[PDB]
């Protein structure tokens, strides 16, 4: 998949495309409908399936540093867009182009001149152009005879509107199971394992910037995977195997994620590690003794073992290769 | 109007004065009664109307950095004192003088030797001298035959005691209309417009230190005035005209004030700008899309247009020259 | 009393000891039972009474910087351990030794090889060894024929479990009288008096790090003692006399303690000062005038005078030499 | 004078203009030649004289946080531009436009489409468009028959090249006299007076100012100069009028960690200028920074700075060309 | 290769080993002699080659925050060790063990009890146990009949002693050529690419990296080198493959206050490497740091760095011994 | 000895006093002459010997944050004053009083009204009152018949002027021997011991102290000196008594950013002094600061500092005049 930064980077010789436009934060199940429709039409005509997306977040252009939290990083947005069949991602920076542009000139510049689009697929909530006056309905009429437009209703399921907004709310509530439900996969973060405490001490510590969306402080059951690597691994964990883990999300009074991998002793310093969240286990608490702390640690392991045993049975969610022991 | 810092700066040849003493933060309607009485008596005898005030706040002398928030800056206190006819302001720093001094020696030093006072006007809540043992009643008796004293009752109106304390409470509640009511004018702040976001982007951004009193975070209707200047102004705003504005007061997680001037495109970087608050519009909120943000922005403009149309009719409050459009 | 840091520092020629093991934070009344039993048995056999304690807090080894607040500093723990007759304190750093060690090897290494113990005294909540699998019951069986073990029930009094945890809760609630009740003495902090405001201004200002346990923000009645010194004292306070004081505990938005010594004018800059807490007086509040501030200051002095007059009558709590005036 | 941010803010009904393009930092005597040529042309043909300038600095666009120090603020660049008769300033942000543009495209879009220019005036060192490919020459060949191009040599005077660079160099060494000479005026900073060590005059300056680290300042030291209280109806504590240049000894310092300060000791006045906006003009270097160990020593040196200043300023008044119309200066204490 | 933290993590069923002990910072040509001897022995007798190394640095244990800069990270020390055939790394923390231990006790506990060693290999400068009492000699006398001891002289080559110290010295002056020569490879750092001034290429590097102050870096300046995108299935913006060394001009800077940066300008590609892990290999010094006052000047010097780099890298490819198997380098633009 | 903050704190029933006025920073041999004259007079006529001193430093009042470093703290100034028999210290804050006062007014208010002085003793460099107008001479003419004035020349000895300034100079270069000689005692700092790298002795100092940036410290380096545990009933970990001066090698450092540290390696003892107040006396410079790359090297140099210290301290004991009454020092390890 090509990734282009700004309209000028798009090849001039690209002759046909089917295009979808959004922030696409999280690439949730709504987002998947748009991508699915776009990919299929691209295949039909033998053109490229293009996603136009935005970075920085368009909200942060108008209201700096009050951008909504990033459900996925830009890099993961690319990975997800690819896994669903996107051929090219065009990334638009509104501080550089397409802000002052009118609905008419936007379609003309972006969709025709730049992307050579025969098809465009947007959500009903789609807006574009100076002061967001462009709508889905605008787009259908401005594209009359020029290109075909398919406007897709926002995904409603089980009485919940599935959007970036609702995924963020669930995450903020610590309800990762509903977030997972809206995303169509286990919510995850990835990052390098740092030195933590030293070398009840966690299998892995990671830190995330405050723009990263994360589950409420608390303890979750989930899976930890050492991303593909030739680097030596200290201990009895292997790369590319999803290992059962009790996960503590905390706030330095910058958010930390501490992972206790069940039934393994490893030290993951230096490695890049994926943490997938499955279910909530408990709220954060203060500890006043080593005894009390380990007691609670063990109850977390038991509850985690239980939740993940269930998770495995929903195998559309569960990883390919996992490691989960029946007991200690 | 002269401004003197400390007793030693007061001219030795000043032969007669009518004096009022207080913090005078905000110069609210109570404060105006004291100034009014003082100015009138000065005119009667042909003497100078003097305000004795204090900086730093006397509270911060005893309890550093737990001083009450400043309703007005010291500079604005001077401006307000002048606009009401004060001839001289004596500023007392209690870390330098008049702290260890007894009620008797205070009247002797400040009122007689320094100020040559024939009249003194204080509020009923007035205290002075070592450990604030001096009262209004003390002052009348210590001044027997030496100078005349007029003690003015605190202003009570509409079931509210009008004081610096109550103005601060209203501001903190986001109730600027009641604060305006107690002040006798639109509450305002002034300051240089800084670079903000770049060059839905606000007409002006200002920053204030944390000792400055400000309305609760939220959006207010008000008026913005470019203070007199020969500097070129980018855009279609003119100096000295009060322009209709939706005002956002925020906190950097130092307080910011962001102003959206209605129906104008200007950039006010470099200019000194007054922001007058008229009425509350809404609480702060997070935005998750550009669409949602602009929707709400437009409702704020509508509600603001409405509030200011009313404000103009209370013309004792409203500015001399304003700019308010009937619609977009 | 000897203080040894780590097992290697303990003299090799020490031939007999009676040993007690715990964090001992606060040396509360439960802790006193263990020490009492240990001291008595040491006297019986003519051996040394040893306390094994821990630093850093064992909790902070597993969960860095989420250690419980220190009721006493390590230095005060030593002082208290001594005042109750302990002959030697062995301080264990779990980041250096005794973490990976099994229950069996722990008793063998610490109690026998290092300490030459004929008696060991622990609380029922006592744990030891890798993953705290060692218990009081373990210890009795592993010590069969090797040394005698006396396991002491946690102290329950007046429906309250007396522990480090409960002392912290009381302190956090601002309930110093119950904390004092559980400690068996007035809760206190000690520290150098710093420059504060200048040279209603407090008799003394002290600052404490955020790991120090302190009463809730508010005003307390208590006693202030200038620790033994040959340094000149500014004012009419003498060292080693416990002086009546209204005490303000605050938070810089690092905790401060501001002390108003009743009926004295002293300046304690440079001196080391003990602050003992007796009872709660009021919550923190903002002040808006010097008048209001002094009014409240005076009510605090009255209420304090009252509480301390009562305190003196419970003379097991009250200091040897105090200073409390009947009135102003 | 109008100020437009971006080519999209330019009035669309602009039929004719004489344009000059550059960073214009400091508006030095070199820059004035460019502006002069442009204004004199515009004034001739009833058209508007436009300046195309750049904010943020093109270097900061390419090398973030490593741009040269600003000789003037953007606000002052506007004010100086207007003072020399420019009718419009167009501020280009290179992160937003005219960056990936070819020399040919740059001319058509900016100079024709946006500005509708009949004349253009640039420095011989002028480079434009992607990878600075366009030069003073490129401009002449591309513009044929459409608009007259006037290329102007960089100003050399007294064996010294007059550029933003040399001005920065002069300032940096504390040589304000050479900086002023290259600028065609007294170098100055403008700023609100802040609270000092306190209000009101054993020790205290008349005025305290702080400046960000992007602001070009003379080397740390003491200088002779003039302070002017910017126009205001707000009252002044002490015996100073607004809009009069007052003789001052000016101390430029750096903060222990934090930023630069400017402390002004106005000669033969006690006043406290907290609350006001103040212009500080530098005339000549007086001495390097020193450490003080006693109050007497500091007061002694203080009195020497007042004498040195008094003299240097007396010469500056006689050299008339740079001094202010109305001022205040006493021959002796 | 296994990694054990502390003597308690070592498999208890370890019957035979050839051991080498040292900080091993940088794994320079001196260190390789130690590892080589050890591996060649272990490989002979079917036993495991163990490295005993130390983290945190023994100096930081004795003098907190005053340890020498790390030539490589601990992660890279492991990777380099494994690359030379070490089977096990035992990481000793001196705050945790082997500190108050006597020479005699150190041998029995570590070398016999823990590691069950039949061979040991150390440098002539080797010191062990409490107060560094044990020396290369002590080791031989204590180990008699139990294990064979092979003491190896510090590597001298071309009149230069090859040690962590001299490597740090070389790096510090910007002499990467001598550092590489003493290392036996191109000096390198590894790190995630961060966001620059923005995404996508007037000014911007191909890649931006930041490094902590414990990381040894060449003196501030420009260098010729190779950048490699570490293995990944993640897509790459632009025309660059993972696992190919690409020619780059590399700029090493310090931050105004904060830390070190490494900016990579990959020759004849525009790509944006945000999100990837990137290895940057240093070949030769190109120039010292300079200040820029104009966009043209910076682009001019930029083009000169590309030429210098192109040449230096051409020589590095010919000197083959240190260059990478697969790479990308063009003779001209 | 009484301590009064402000003229209003002075007992109103003070009928007679001999007064000396000055900053008195460091209480050096010059200052002792002033105090001696004053005490010897007061002691004669049954009156109190008063010191008028100043806090904050008069320079910091005039030039905030640019006062000279404090040779001693205000606490130590009091203690030193009392040690030389001063009965009362009056601390004047120039932000609060005696600032706008005329020479004539200063005498009447402070010397007569407040202190009721019959004798006064000042240095020839003495200046008092608004704009330092009053000098040593002014004082004599204003005081006639009311109080006897004794002006004392600044102390010159061995071609060296003894002043706060020169003491600061000596300290700054690391020449504690000359500082001590000018002071008439071992220079010292006093402070609570903080936690080091940890508790208890491979590497670790006996004691760690930190000092603010207003505190005068010898140049970074190693020094010979004595450490004394200030009087206490609190237990001491290790084999050290309170109130005994113990031989120590003393390392003075600066923090990477943050502040100064003082680390004390007490000779032939292991003790941990966390929790105690400790006095550290400097005797002689041992060496400049160095960087360490290996544990052996640091221990080697460590042992050399112990030898150098042992010798220098042996000489200091023989020169008796400055050494302490009770001390602890061993001839060899």
Numbering used by the authors:
A (entry chain A), B (entry chain A), C (entry chain A): 1 to 199, 205 to 258, 264 to 338
D (entry chain B), E (entry chain B), F (entry chain B): 1 to 200, 203 to 260, 264 to 338
Quote the original article.
The FAD synthetase from Corynebacterium ammoniagenes (CaFADS) is a bifunctional enzyme responsible for the synthesis of flavin mononucleotide (FMN) and flavin adenine dinucleotide (FAD) cofactors. The C-terminal module catalyzes FMN synthesis from riboflavin (RF) (riboflavin kinase, RFK), while the N-terminal one transforms FMN into FAD (FMN:adenylyltransferase, FMNAT). Bioinformatic tools for the exploration of macromolecular interfaces predict that CaFADS might stabilize in hexameric assemblies in solution, organized as dimer of trimers. In the predicted CaFADS dimer of trimers model, the protomers adopt a head-to-tail organization within each trimer that causes the RFK and FMNAT catalytic sites of two neighboring protomers 6 to be in proximity.
The overall structures of F206W, D298E and E301A CaFADSs are quite similar to that of the WT (A chains r.m.s.d. values 0.149, 0.152 and 0.251 Å, superimposing 274, 309 and 317 atoms, respectively). Thus, in the F206W structure, residues 200–204 in chain A and 201–202 in chain B from L1c, as well as residues 259–263 (in chain A) and 261–264 (in chain B) from L4c-FlapII, are not observed. For the F206W variant, the side chain of the introduced tryptophan was refined in slightly different conformations for each of the two molecules of the asymmetric unit. Both differ from those of F206 in the WT structure and in the substrate-bound complex. Moreover, residues 197–199 on L1c-FlapI of F206W CaFADS were displaced relative to those of the WT, contributing to the opening of the cavity where ADP binds in the RFK module. Noticeably, these residues immediately precede the region that stabilizes a 310 α-helix (199–204) in the ternary complex structure of the CaFADS RFK module that contains the reaction products, FMN:ADP:Mg2+. The PISA server predicts a dimer of trimers for the F206W structure, in which the orientations of F62 and W206 side chains from the two neighboring protomers differ from the WT, and the distance between the aromatic rings increases by 1.34 Å. In the WT CaFADS dimer of trimers, K202 and E203 stabilize salt-bridges with E130 and N131 from loop L8n of the neighboring protomer within the trimer, while F206 interacts with F62 of helix α2n. The mutation of K202 and E203 to Ala would prevent formation of the salt-bridges, while substitution of F206 by Ala or Lys will abrogate its hydrophobic interaction with F62. With the elimination of such interactions, the shape of the isoalloxazine hydrophobic cavity in the FMNAT site should change, as found when evaluating this cavity in the dimer of trimers assembly for the F206W variant. This conservative substitution apparently reduces the amount of oligomeric assemblies able to bind FMN and FAD at the FMNAT site, relative to the WT, an effect that is clearly overcome in the ternary complex.
